[PDB]
Amino acid sequence: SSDTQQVQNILELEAKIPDILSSAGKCIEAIQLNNSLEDFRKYSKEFLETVEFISTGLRRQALELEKAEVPVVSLQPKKRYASTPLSNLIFDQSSKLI
């Protein structure tokens, strides 16, 4: 992952969390409703994974952000004047301005 791609990884990681609540409500349902030990016997082998593996993915996104070492402070820009594409494009307009 590079540029937005880490952030994009988080973006599709986004929906990976809310349904864990479905898995958990079902974790309750395993004995509250379904009355079967086997269910939560499986979902305790699921809920903790669905949560924690995402958590590790996050903590590694952050620690490897800390490896990528992007500066946190925003530079105070100098009053910028003209980038080259701006300049020559203005020249193109000047042709149009002829």
Q: Residues in the site for other proteins, rule: CB under 8 A?
A: 73-74, 76-77, 79-83, 85-86, 89-90, 92-93, 96-97
Shortest reach from residue 33's CB to other proteins, in Å = 22
Q: Which residue, 11 or 48, is less far from other proteins as judged by CB? A: 11
Give the nearest distance from C-beta 79 to other proteins in angstroms.
6
d(Cα 3, Cα 11) in Å, to the nearest integer? 13
Q: What distance in Å separates the CA atoms of residue 28 and residue 30, rounded to the nearest whole number?
A: 5
**How far is it, in rounded angstroms, from Cα 66 to Cα 6?**
13
